[PDB]
């Protein structure tokens with residue numbers, strides 16, 4: 730019982746784009762851009778669509794970098810998050826009622842204001858490693874258990 734989500738990191742040689750979510754799921758935290766995959770839509774097409782919706786940016790090729798499954802205790806559905814990165818975008822990041830984008834130098838990624846699991850897998854993304862992870866959460870702040878391994882094929 731899992732539901733598909735996407736997550737896109739615009740990762741350039743010296744900086745990464747994140748968005749401050751203003752409401753709803755994950756509000757108040759910096760995040761990549763993504764959301765639910767639609768009926769009849771490929772995961773990658775969903776990732777490209779959500780990047781545009783949430784950041785205003787157009788991406789062509791997206792590179793698969795990981796899969797992370799999230800369990801929230803007390804919630805039936807697991808989140809099956811397909812993570813992608815890109816270094817070539819078009820457009821300029823757009824602030825909307827839903828998200829405030831902002832570039833971060835790689836040594837200044839705001840982990841204290843991000844979901845706590847990101848501290849584990851972001852360093853792999855930064856070194857161009859691919860991964861499979863699982864995180865069991867209680868609430869939005871507490872990781873009860875996790876696994877995380879590097880893979881050759883996402």
Ligand SMILES: Nc1nc2ncccc2[nH]1
Nearest residue numbers: 760761799844845846847
């Ligand atoms: N970047 C990111 N980390 C997350 N952790 C748990 C749920 C959703 C998440 N999005």
